[PDB]
Amino acid sequence: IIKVIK
Amino acid sequence: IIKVIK
Amino acid sequence: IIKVIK
Amino acid sequence: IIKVIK
Amino acid sequence: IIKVIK
Amino acid sequence: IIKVIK
Amino acid sequence: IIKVIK
Amino acid sequence: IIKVIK
Amino acid sequence: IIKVIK
Amino acid sequence: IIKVIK
Amino acid sequence: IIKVIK
Amino acid sequence: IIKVIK
Amino acid sequence: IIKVIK
Amino acid sequence: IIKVIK
Amino acid sequence: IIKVIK
Amino acid sequence: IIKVIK
Amino acid sequence: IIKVIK
Amino acid sequence: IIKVIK
């Protein structure tokens, strides 16, 4: 599980 | 599971 | 599962 | 499952 | 399943 | 599990 | 588990 | 477990 | 367990 | 660009 | 760019 | 860029 | 850039 | 940049 | 930059 | 920069 | 910079 | 800089 916000 | 917002 | 918003 | 919005 | 909006 | 906000 | 905010 | 805020 | 704030 | 092999 | 092999 | 092998 | 092997 | 091997 | 091997 | 081996 | 081996 | 071996 990988979650990224930029 | 990969979730990305840019 | 891959979900991407740009 | 791949979902993409640009 | 592949869903794309540009 | 990896979660990143920049 | 890795969680990063910059 | 690694948690970082900068 | 590693927790860092800068 | 989306490329998938199963 | 999304590339997946299963 | 997202690349996944399972 | 996200690269995952399982 | 996120790179994971399991 | 996050790199993980398990 | 976070690097982890288990 | 965080580097961990277990 | 944090470096840990167990």
Numbering used by the authors:
A (entry chain A), B (entry chain A), C (entry chain A), D (entry chain A), E (entry chain A), F (entry chain A), ...: 1 to 6
From the paper:
High expression of PSMαs, which are four peptides of about 20-residues in length, increases virulence potential of methicillin-resistant S. aureus (MRSA). Amyloid aggregation plays roles in PSM activities in S. aureus. In the present study, we investigated the structure-function relationships of PSMαs and their short truncations.
To obtain atomic-level insights into the architecture of PSMα1 and PSMα4 fibrils, we computationally identified their amyloidogenic spine segments, and determined their high-resolution structures by means of X-ray microcrystallography. Segments PSMα1-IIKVIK and PSMα4-IIKIIK, both of which are conserved within naturally occurring PSM truncations, adopt the canonical cross-β fibril architecture, wherein pairs of β-sheets tightly mate through a dry interface, forming a steric zipper. Both structures belong to the class 1 of steric zippers, indicating that parallel β-sheets mate face-to-face in the fibrils formed by the PSMα1-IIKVIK and PSMα4-IIKIIK segments. Proline substitutions in these spine regions abolished fibril formation of the full-length PSMα1 and PSMα4. Structural indicators of fibril stability of the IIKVIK and IIKIIK segments, i.e., buried surface area and shape complementarity between sheets, calculated from the crystal structures, resemble those of eukaryotic steric-zipper structures. Specifically, the steric-zipper segment PSMα1-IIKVIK showed a peak at 1621 cm−1 corresponding to rigid cross-β amyloid fibrils, in accordance with the crystal structure. For example, fibrillation of PSMα1 promotes biofilm stability by preventing disassembly by matrix-degrading enzymes and mechanical stress. While PSMα3 forms cross-α fibrils and enhances toxicity against human cells, PSMα1 and PSMα4 form cross-β fibrils which likely play a role in stabilizing the biofilm matrix. The highly stable steric zipper structures, forming the spines of the cross-β fibrils, putatively serve as the building block cementing the biofilm and creating the rigidity that can explain the resistance of amyloid-containing biofilms. The atomic structures of the PSMα1 and PSMα4 derivatives offer templates for the design of anti-biofilm compounds.
